[PDB]
Design a protein around this ligand. Structure first.
Ligand SMILES: [Ca+2]
Length: 134
């Protein structure tokens, strides 16, 4: 099981809740950007094998967020690997798994949530996960 270092984070926008708040280890700090289609981009610093992205959602136990995950070797050429909606059932890191593939950049695009148009993420982690489960 490998959790990759995130050397840099950028976003399409933020409201003062900075993109770097997603990699500070603190569920009490967040990235926020208002509107469907806002996004946050993680840099691993080099190409790695990735098969899982975890995101902890702001008010994640009270509302569902629509999102898509894309990845690739450069931000101008990303491919979608995952699309869905957060569970609405936890504030913890929630795992989004997909077929293992090479990426340096991971982008989460948000489509707002079940309460309002905000995209608010408290933590992200990027993995090469092995076999896991009860
Ligand atoms: Ca945080």
């Amino acid at each position: 099981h490998m959790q990759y270092d995130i050397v840099a984070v950028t976003a399409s926008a933020h409201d003062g809740n900075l993109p770097e708040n997603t990699i500070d280890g603190n569920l009490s700090t967040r990235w926020s950007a208002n509107g469907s289609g806002q996004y946050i981009t993680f840099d691993l610093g080099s190409a790695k094998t990735v098969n899982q992205v975890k995101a902890a959602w702001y008010n994640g136990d009270s509302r569902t967020s629509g999102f898509s995950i894309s990845l690739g070797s450069d931000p101008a050429s990303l491919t979608e690997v995952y699309s869905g909606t957060s569970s609405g059932q936890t504030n913890a890191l929630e795992s989004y798994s997909f077929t293992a593939t090479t990426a340096r950049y991971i982008r989460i695009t948000g489509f707002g949530n079940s309460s309002n148009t905000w995209n608010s993420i408290t933590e992200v982690a990027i993995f090469h996960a092995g076999e896991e489960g009860d």
